Amino acid sequence: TVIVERWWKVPLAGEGRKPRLHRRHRVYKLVEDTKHRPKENLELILTQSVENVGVRGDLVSVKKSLGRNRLLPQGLAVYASPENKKLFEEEKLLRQEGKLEKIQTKAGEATVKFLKSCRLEVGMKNNVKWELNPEIVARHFFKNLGVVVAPHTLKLPEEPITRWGEYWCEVTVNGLDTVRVPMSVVNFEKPKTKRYKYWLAQ
């Protein structure tokens, strides 16, 4: 929006009268064009799940382009009006205490999708005798797959693993979804050696 102001003063008209406009009062200066202003975010309440944010009832501040051109037209989100906030707020209470079941958080859904399609390379050193336990296996998610897994969540095959081979790790994400990821125990190779050996070679 173009906002303008007059160069010349307009004489006061008084109460109940229209201003007397000379032709000099048509000369304007551009005060501001509001399209050049810093863009503000649009506050929406989500309905379905989206990769960025997916917790139904989560107050999200998105770019006006995203909300207007995708979320709102398709119904994935609704306006954060006082009436909508009340309805979604009430539903939250029921989920916490009522019959309504609890649902993954925004990050929980992202991890579950990643955990469904990933394989862990549990690199173990040959020299030192090693026994695989939840704590050690948890460390490899951080290093290899980049997932930060709590030690208690991991459920190992319960058979002591001291030999290179394949097994299965059952990961529980926030206590609701249990994912079983393939486990590939392999001889440990240092980061520099492994990258130079294969990544550089091929």
């Binding site: 991890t111 990643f114 704590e135 980049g146 930060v148 208690h152 926030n174």
Partner: protein, 252 residues
């Protein structure tokens, strides 16, 4: 303030960071900022990783410090090497120092203070005509004219007044070097300083004290309150990832 250098300083400050583990039990690292802070917990955690990742109980903790070594004024400071011994020097033994002093009583003071290589023309000629390696060099003003021969050989590593390595009193760097540990500087001058602090087996409190000593040691170059000298601190073991310490309380 060159755009690239100053912009990165703004960018590194921008990197978000958070306190405490997120509510979610299992969370992708990408989804949340850096979290681990406290220096005490950091050392305790580095010991934990050593057990999980089977490795030597004693490892060099190569603390890397992204210390704002620039932007005092719009003119940036320069990289130097303030050498000071930590409260508990780790078990590494380093005693490599060359002292240039010819036909002077300083020859005695040099060796008396633990000089490894002390000599005059004979020592200077040996450096030019034959290969020899020393960690740091010192020379008295009287020998600087003769020592100029090795200026080209040492590629600006020869003694300079800027590094306080030219003076009648040699023990500035000579004496403190053996117990002292050099605060080397980056080659790219990106402001990250790789400086070992302690062995992994050193007690947390001793490593914590060793950390604080360096904080004052590093600010010695520019201890002015005009420009902040410290931005981030990554305490990493030899075979572990760096952890973002909460160094703000320990800065002053």
């Amino acid at each position: 303030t060159p755009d690239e250098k100053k912009d990165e300083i703004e960018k590194i400050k921008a990197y978000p960071y958070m306190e405490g583990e997120p509510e979610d039990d299992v969370y992708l690292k990408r989804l949340y900022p850096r979290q681990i802070y406290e220096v005490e917990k950091a050392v305790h955690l580095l010991k934990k990783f050593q057990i999980l990742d089977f490795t030597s109980p004693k490892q060099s903790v190569y603390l890397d410090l992204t210390l704002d070594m620039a932007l005092g004024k719009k003119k940036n400071v320069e990289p130097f090497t303030s050498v000071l011994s930590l409260p508990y020097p780790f078990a590494s033994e380093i005693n490599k120092v060359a002292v240039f002093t010819e036909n002077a009583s300083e020859v005695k003071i040099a060796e008396e203070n633990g000089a490894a290589f002390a000599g005059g023309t004979s020592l200077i000629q040996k450096i030019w005509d034959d290969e020899i390696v020393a960690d740091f060099y010192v020379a008295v003003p009287e020998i600087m004219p003769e020592l100029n021969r090795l200026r080209k050989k040492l590629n600006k590593k020869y003694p300079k007044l800027s590094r306080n390595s030219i003076g009648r009193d040699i023990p500035k760097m000579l004496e403190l070097f053996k117990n002292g540990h050099e605060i080397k500087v980056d080659e790219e001058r990106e402001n990250f300083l790789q400086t070992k602090i302690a062995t992994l087996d050193m007690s947390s409190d001793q490593i914590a004290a060793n950390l604080q000593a360096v904080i004052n040691e590093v600010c010695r170059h520019r201890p002015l309150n005009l420009g902040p000298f410290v931005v981030r601190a990554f305490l990493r073991s030899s075979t572990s990832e760096g952890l973002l310490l909460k160094i703000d309380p320990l800065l002053p």
